[PDB]
Symmetry: D2
Subunit: 385 residues, 4 copies
């Protein structure tokens, strides 16, 4: 189960680089040089890396210092063959963003948030990124009167419309992906799920430039079914990127390595991504637990990739099993893919077999055979077939 | 705090009519005649009632029996002045719907679900309803292989498109509202939140005919902020109807009377509905607990209305308080309503006060004053002002 | 992975016998004769069955009817070799129990609850049960003023003390197990977790007669770690019985077949039960989904047993792997089992290596190696070793 | 609603002193001198303050530096009349505690945790504290194999037994209180609820020295009813201390000011504490949101006290209302306080009115009148009576 760069596995600098500070504890690991992270991830078989502006260039850097941080980074990419497919903006760490970036109540903060973002879009294009992610982690409230949500959505639309006007006028080939999260670090965060983000995009001036970047753990922080939400994003044609990790239920954002947390949900996610032909990066947004030293960091990163490849094998074996194919027919998944009324409305109204002469008790008695199908799926996952 | 029919309070027949059967227990109350419910609700000050087809006309009724059930019901409305502003379809109780109505795997069940719905749309128009609600309580799954969600969303779109073609061709003045719920009675339900429903509507052939009917308790079953979701529905212009009740956190659907459960969330909800000028029905989808006899049923229904009117008074007093108006300015809610960059993109890029000469430390030091504002809101809610 | 009666797998009559009624739907399956359930479970390889009084003898039965229901049941046990290791009382379905049994506000209901329980204890002993389970599903409240919880705990202690006096005076060899659940069907249920039940038992007059009967899904309805709670019950010497099923997070009680829901939690549960030498019944309290016909009922029951046996194999292979044994030493699980200060308090206070000369930075730098250990556990679960 | 020191309101140094660092953001406020916090809290009407060792004496301090930090602190207490009723140990911030203090896998860390605790017990007694709190925030795991929970509970019992031997041998008048929390910062924390802590205490060598210190938000992080858990702690005689704050459901630990979050739960909590005659400190463990400057810190602290005093007034008015007293009788709260069978077991078995001649249908028809009682409680809370 060895990864190659053809598997398109990517990692954020901030993931293996997390020093282990949490709300109740200081750092347990020293800071990593981005150049060292690129080299070590390349040896594990990764395809590329991602960054926030402030991961790569320390906040407050002069233009000369900025030049040389980028230069060192580019040499490591050239020296390893690593790519940069996605970048994003840090609009959450600095105290100026304590009430938000794009939807801060103070207007001068909102303008500064836009200028900080635009500067990093230029850098992202220079490094070859095709997707630009926005996670509005500070957009929200802890109390009800602090934020008029209709005015805040006006300001959020204004910001994303201006970013779309900028990339159009510059002739850039980059698209935007909005990353939803329901809460943490704000009491409630605006656009809290995949659904809310998809609905918001349809109100932007150029909806074709915007999609979603869902995260496993974030939808599970609201108790939702992550493969179901991904399926709705694919159905809408909006799955531009994806963040993979693990989460144990409704609690703080754990960011466990992928495959930990809800294992069966990870199986059904890989089944869906591979069956639908998703061709974007398989990005890991995770934190090696602060119990670990650096050997444990690289073991945890390797585990992300290994677990994806094991689940891919088991999902492919499940769908290729003739006995599974007949079970799917037994449960009428073939009929679910057929139109309800391709004959049209008038024919449906005139069809007495659809109502007047429909035998409801005979139809109700038909078992769905879902439990036998699910145990076949369980046997394949566990390698008991 | 006495309600009048001008307050537009409405109740479902199935609410005060719930006999008290739950998953572990038999009924504790006898069945109510719909005519008796109309009379008793009118004396409490309600504006109108709502129904599923199967609440009004017992399943399997002949056409003659159907005539006389409707006739009796219409006489009670004439005898009381009660209105019928909303109706909906029961596509969840009968065993034939055990895998769904519009997205059942069996195609013949899907056609029957459509015909059962269309028959009740005709009746709803006859009785004067302006909104037709769809709650797809059986659309979903308990296991991952049972339901291909992309095919299911194709079938859900096909059904709603056909219903829109029917109402257009008949010349009906009625609109549709989709009611989301995250789970129960299925393990996961399709379109689980307000956001997912709003995004789905934008893919229908005639999006102007469809809005949402959110329920307090349903969004709280996913831990979400209900006033925030309502604000996004209002921002999109899609709040066609609303279901009011109470819920104590993430657990089974409690359907407590409105004002029970999360009291502060109810306060901020009433503040939002009244400030935005929502003019639709204030509908209660609740269940009097099965501990109660019939005197307790009517006390619980009266409590729904009383709590709305108390919160309306306290929310209006909060917004009219000069000291609250100055606190809102102190927290810069006025600046949140102002455009970020009405000067346009080029001016923003050329504005050195937005980046090169922006003092981030001076801006970060400004307190938001949110806690004083929230304690003023708490004092108003409790009548300590 | 074929079960034999030596595996001690047991099932409640109410599990495979569930007709499929849920809060929003009527039954989808006909009622099963208890005699037929005993025969079919014996052919699947079960060890025995369990019952509530009202599963076996319909409520309101005459003494003659009661005789003949028991006689038929005993003949099926003799004809199959099936055992009855546990029984319990139905104090939740009948409307008289709408505010509780042992803690109902009405005193005459509490006395009736005790007499109904005592009558079934006699029958349980006659049939050879060694454990008597109490699930107080109606003991609780939906609102704060309805139930003074200190008075309710007085009444709960009084009831269990009287049941202990009865079994002592009769000379019965049976023990009691309290089954906790946090909510549903009451808004909150008294003694909501394993911990609350264990603490309550220590206040009874004869604590040695009482233990717990925890259920997988019930502790997960509060977001808790089920193997952790079982470990505390074993540590206290109070795990008298256990209920196995599956649950997908914090929501209504799903009662999925064992192994569904949180698969990794099921793995760590089987590891713990087998390592600690638990020798009681492996009881399944589950509901075949109402989508299924009777063939699906027996497939779901068979799946319960199969999944336990697969996880048992993988857990045993994990603990027997020499590379896992060295990883456990690398993470210092051996040191966790060693006393902190067998040298005593005075020696600890005099030990300068424990404080004055302890190198905290050298100790803090030691990685725990937990992630490599957990990936070895994941590889064993999936059969990638 | 002005507090006086007779109201026994207390605050931790770490509460108003929180600088605003969260997992995604740097500090927004400068550090407070403990002397300044004592002075400002005294002017607001507080009774006293609490501390962790590391709040008062920076980690790594020399014995001379330690002397002078304590001396300055004692002068501020003398200069204000403020008391110190509780103290506790920081066993969670330093990296050495990344796998726990008392249950760390490394034995040398466990010994150091005990010595760090004992040193602060001496200081607490010197300052007059009557309660010593233990919050084992790092005791737990993120993965299943990292922690054998039975060995960990052995080590936890060993630590608390040694602390009890120390205070006994020194002749100290101080008692211990264990503070439970279900998760955060570990994936699962040992002793996760009030119930688990109460059960654990009964296994210690000297159970009379140990009680619980429950926190509002912590029990709500598991979806539990906080007044119910407090009632069980009072029933067991173990409520030695209490932590008051607010929490909005199941998510990260918010530590909102008291009265925010679940307002009705706060009302029923104050009703219970005042009715049972709880005479310990009313301690606030809260964090002023990082949106606030120092004026907002003191406004948030003042709000904690104000909300307690408003709820106390409304709860007292509720219990003193003659119409509420008759509603309580209507719902048979008087009968719940009466013994079920003071006549004893034999009389109960011989009482035909308890079973053979009990009219179950007449009893089942009696309404409980809980909804009218709860609306009277709602009217009193809102000041609509
Ligand atoms: Mg995350
Ligand atoms: Mg992410
Ligand atoms: Mg509901
Ligand atoms: Mg509803
Ligand atoms: Mg259950
Ligand atoms: Mg059970
Ligand atoms: Mg807390
Ligand atoms: Mg605390």
């Amino acid at each position: 189960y060895q990864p190659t760069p053809e598997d398109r596995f990517t990692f954020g600098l901030w993931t293996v680089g997390w020093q282990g500070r949490d709300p109740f504890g200081d750092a347990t690991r020293r800071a990593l040089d981005p150049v060292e992270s690129v080299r070590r991830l390349a040896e594990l078989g990764a395809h590329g890396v991602t960054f926030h502006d402030d991961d790569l260039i320390p906040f407050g850097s002069s233009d000369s210092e900025r030049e040389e941080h980028v230069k060192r980074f580019r040499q490591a990419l050239d020296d390893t063959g690593m790519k940069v497919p996605m970048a994003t903006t840090n609009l959450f760490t600095h105290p100026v963003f304590k009430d938000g970036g794009f939807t801060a109540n103070d207007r001068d903060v909102r303008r500064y948030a836009l200028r900080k973002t635009i500067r990093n879009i230029d850098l992202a294009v220079e490094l070859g990124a095709e997707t630009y992610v926005a996670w509005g982690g500070r957009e929200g409230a802890e109390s009800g009167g602090a934020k008029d949500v209709r005015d805040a959505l006006d300001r959020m639309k204004e910001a994303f419309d201006l970013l779309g006007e900028y990339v159009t006028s510059q002739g850039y080939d980059i698209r935007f992906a909005i990353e939803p999260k329901p809460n943490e670090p704000r009491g409630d965060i605006l656009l809290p799920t995949v659904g809310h983000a998809l609905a918001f995009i349809e109100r932007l001036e150029r909806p074709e430039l915007y999609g979603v970047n869902p995260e496993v753990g974030h939808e599970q922080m609201a108790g939702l079914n992550f493969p179901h939400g991904i399926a709705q994003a694919l159905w809408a044609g909006k799955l531009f990127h994806i963040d993979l990790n693990g989460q144990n239920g409704i609690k703080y954002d754990q960011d466990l390595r992928f495959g930990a947390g809800d294992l069966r949900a990870a199986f059904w996610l890989v089944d869906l991504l591979e069956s639908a032909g998703y061709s974007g990066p398989r990005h890991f947004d995770f934190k090696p637990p602060r119990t670990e030293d650096f050997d444990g960091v690289w073991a945890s990163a390797a585990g992300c990739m290994r677990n994806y490849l094991i689940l891919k094998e088991r999902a492919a074996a499940f769908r290729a099993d003739p006995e599974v194919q007949e079970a799917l027919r037994a449960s009428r998944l073939d009929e679910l893919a057929r139109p309800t009324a391709a004959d049209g409305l008038q024919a449906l109204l005139d069809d007495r077999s659809a109502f007047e002469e429909f035998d409801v008790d005979a139809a109700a008695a038909r078992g769905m055979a879902f439990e036998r199908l699910d145990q076949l799926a369980m046997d394949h996952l566990l390698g008991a077939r």
